[PDB]
Design a protein around this ligand. Sequence first.
Ligand SMILES: Nc1nc2c(ncn2[C@@H]2O[C@H](COP(=O)(O)OP(=O)(O)OP(=O)(O)O)[C@@H](O)[C@H]2O)c(=O)[nH]1
Length: 457
Amino acid sequence: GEIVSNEKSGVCINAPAKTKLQPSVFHQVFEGSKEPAVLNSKDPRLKTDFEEAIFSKYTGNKIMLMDEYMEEAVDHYVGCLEPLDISVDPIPLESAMYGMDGLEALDLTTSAGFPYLLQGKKKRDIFNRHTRDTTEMTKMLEKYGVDLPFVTFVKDELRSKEKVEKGKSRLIEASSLNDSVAMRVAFGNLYATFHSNPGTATGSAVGCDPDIFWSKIPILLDGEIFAFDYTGYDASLSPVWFACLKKVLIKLGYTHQTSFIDYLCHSVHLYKDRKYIVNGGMPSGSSGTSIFNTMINNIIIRTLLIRVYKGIDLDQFKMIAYGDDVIASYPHKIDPALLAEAGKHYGLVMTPADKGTSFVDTNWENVTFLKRYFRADDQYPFLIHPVMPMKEIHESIRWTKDPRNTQDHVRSLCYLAWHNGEEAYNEFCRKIRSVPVGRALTLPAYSSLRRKWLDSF
Ligand SMILES: Nc1nc2c(ncn2[C@@H]2O[C@H](COP(=O)(O)OP(=O)(O)OP(=O)(O)O)[C@@H](O)[C@H]2O)c(=O)[nH]1
């Protein structure tokens, strides 16, 4: 990803200077070091230029036409997807807006994007989940069209003290409501297929249920495990990776809808009173960002494997990925340090899994996926617990954007926490009930959460 242009947009995007994250009632109870991310360049916590930091993710492009490894990697991934029988047909407008089998309704809580945010117009002024009306969206598609700019927001989230000082805040590139809906029309059936088929054919975990799907993961990835980290994955994508993705879509039957992939690769963005064009890089908050980044990751690993290892047999290779996060398997040991050496040739920055200093071996006890660990059950060791560290749950419970939502928040964290055991769950359930706001909530018991968990298999 490279910013090839920066011009005067003609409009102004005014984002708020103050974060919505306020310390919660549990700010003192539990310990934590994360603070709200830097949103403006005048934040006293800064220790370097804000706009230099947030845009430095664009490290440049490796301009190249698809090499032979990419072509073979593309074919193999197409071969894995062939039995899924993906329909390139478009889904009706009502389903793209309000949902169908395997596709949740479009999220109404986020920005409608350009130009609606400049008109005091929100998604609920066009969308109406109760009536499921489409006439307003049809008129809006007719009036403002497609291939509209993205709106760059600083992501208002918790970050480490280190990333607060270095200004490493993340960005949301919010698609126009027109382009999200139109893209969901073009690729909706593919989204549904992926969401309903997490595994090693899709190589995807998007739309999965960790409670259910964690047990299938070690069965699918039944060989020598390896994993690694990406630094700035989305923005590091060169256009050639978008070309591979296009060739995958073409082999599945897509024709005119590959234009949406061009729309993500060569993208227009609005930030403040600026209008900048990025050559390459995946936008953060486009519809289908997760899946297309997941499909591109399938192409990347395969490409690197063929390039590094001489007589690799991709039909013995298996992987599951969610955006940049990937867990992979091969019968013989694969060293990610050698793969990273090849990924730098393509502009990819691959580093040891989970911020480690060294490249050490990956096993079913240290490996994580979607921040969660793998721990088998004691009574049913064939059932694998997805274990979110209590650390992440403490960092999260300590802040809130809406103290009215404390109940939903805490119980959401209870669905994640009880996988750490009876000891951790009740310690965390006891510390919550240690303040007046706590015991007023409804906290499920360890035995009850377990009851529904095992009833699902
Ligand atoms: N910018 C952005 N990235 C997102 C978002 N959601 C998921 N991501 C992914 O998360 C990655 C950003 O992770 P960071 O917190 O910046 O960490 P990092 O890029 O791996 O950098 P290091 O942690 O130092 O290695 C991006 O590469 C995206 O692929 C989002 O809303 N905005």
